[PDB]
């Protein structure tokens, strides 16, 4: 599942060749083009790297900490130069400057899936089959090649582009950056992680499953939509601490029946089993009926995406 396509192998080669031409990244070398969005502790800009002419996405994480500390995150982040996969957002470099840490990456012109979902309303099952393949492959890659688990799968961390690529970002490559930060939503965290118990890649599988249900139905799915909400949805509020308690104590969300294929409902159900030991693992998901069916479908993801977000 980590074997590269010809077109994929080529795109990777092109990104690396371009990358080699970029030297050490420095603050003054960037011109801001626009604001891509912001989280609970970071802002992201679309920027031009003046010298190279490359357009990048630059994330600034404003953090006030001794030169000692900062210099350590920069060190761990250097691992990103080794994360090369069609399913992982490309990295250019990381530097510290005037209080904030900068992480420069490949700009994804389709933005993140939370943005796409807001535009689309809900994302069709066949499109989510391709998204599922990408996420599982991206997680397999991180695990196999870098012994890293993502730790923060959610729609805003899956990015897409007009070429039809789907990629993960914001994965836990640096332990120190994770600690020095660590308030990001806990709303996609597995029950085991919320309970302080057992967490491995199994926990990313839960987050992917919950993210797929949200994108399929068009709404964060906890607590479940009542009969009349589903009726308006297809024809066919809780405070954060209340929501995390719900996740730990109540049965997992599921897709509504009768609108999605049984293979897709079964796939999400296997990702959402509360017991991480019973929950499917990457190897099992890679050969799940829904994944095999989706891999065989010729889905024009870029055409769907471009039409939907009005790209162009
Ligand atoms: N490489 C990139 N290309 C295009 N858009 C990007 C890229 N990286 C980030 N973005 C956008 O920038 C937004 C802000 O990113 P983040 O600061 O990581 O916040 P978030 O992921 O939305 O929320 P938190 O901080 O985890 S709660 C994302 O939601 C994406 O829409
Ligand atoms: O950025 C991260 N989380 O979201 C930040 C949010 O803005 C906080 O509110 C993050 C967390 C831990 C870590 F180890 C990283 F490497 C991170 N960033 C990160 C990882 C891979 C790539 I390719 C690009 C980036 Cl940027
Ligand atoms: Ca400067
Ligand atoms: Mg993010
Ligand atoms: Na600056």
Kindly describe this structure:
It is classed as transferase. The entry lists the keywords ATP-binding, Disease mutation, Kinase, Nucleotide-binding, Phosphoprotein, Serine/threonine-protein kinase, Tyrosine-protein kinase. It forms a monomeric assembly. There is one protein chain. Helices cover 42% and strands 14% of the residues. It is an alpha+beta fold and 312 residues long. It has two domains: 1-109, Phosphorylase Kinase, domain 1; 110-312, Transferase(Phosphotransferase) domain 1 (Transferase(Phosphotransferase), domain 1, Orthogonal Bundle), CATH 1.10.510. It has a five-stranded antiparallel β-sheet, covered by helices on one side. It has a two-stranded antiparallel ribbon with strand order 6-7. Helix 4 (125-146) runs antiparallel to helix 7 and helix 7 crosses helix 10. The structure holds phosphothiophosphoric acid-adenylate ester (AGS), ligand 3BM, calcium ion, magnesium ion and sodium ion (NA). Residues 36-42, 44, 57, 89, 105-108, 111-112, 115, 156-157, 159, 169-170, 184-185 line the site of phosphothiophosphoric acid-adenylate ester.
């Amino acid at each position: 599942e980590l074997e590269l396509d010809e077109q994929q192998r080529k795109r990777l080669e092109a990104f690396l060749t371009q990358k080699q031409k970029v030297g050490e990244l420095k603050d003054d070398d960037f011109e801001k083009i626009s604001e891509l969005g912001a989280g609970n502790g970071g802002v992201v800009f679309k920027v031009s790297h003046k010298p190279s002419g490359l357009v990048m996405a630059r994330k600034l994480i404003h953090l006030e900490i001794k030169p000692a500390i900062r210099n350590q995150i920069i060190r761990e982040l250097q691992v990103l130069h080794e994360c090369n996969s069609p399913y992982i957002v490309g990295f250019y470099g990381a530097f510290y400057s005037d209080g904030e840490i900068s992480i420069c990456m490949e700009h994804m012109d389709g933005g993140s899936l939370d943005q796409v979902l807001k535009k689309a309303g809900r994302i069709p099952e066949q499109i989510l089959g391709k998204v599922s393949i990408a996420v599982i492959k991206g997680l397999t890659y991180l695990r196999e090649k870098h012994k890293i688990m993502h730790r923060d799968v959610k729609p805003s961390n899956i990015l897409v582009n007009s070429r039809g690529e789907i990629k993960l970002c914001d994965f836990g490559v640096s332990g120190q950056l994770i600690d020095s930060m660590a308030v990001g939503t806990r709303s996609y965290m597995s029950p085991e992680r919320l309970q302080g118990t057992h967490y491995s890649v199994q926990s990313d599988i839960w987050s992917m499953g919950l993210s797929l249900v949200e994108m399929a139905v068009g709404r964060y799915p906890i607590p479940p939509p009542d009969a009349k909400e589903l009726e308006l949805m297809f024809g066919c509020p809780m405070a954060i601490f209340e929501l995390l308690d719900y996740i730990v104590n109540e049965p997992p969300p599921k897709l509504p029946s009768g609108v999605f294929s049984l293979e897709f409902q079964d796939f999400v159900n296997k990702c959402l089993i509360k017991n991480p030991a019973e929950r499917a693992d990457l190897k099992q998901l890679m050969v799940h009926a829904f994944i095999k069916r989706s891999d065989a479908e010729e889905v024009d993801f870029a055409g769907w995406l471009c039409s939907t977000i009005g790209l162009n």
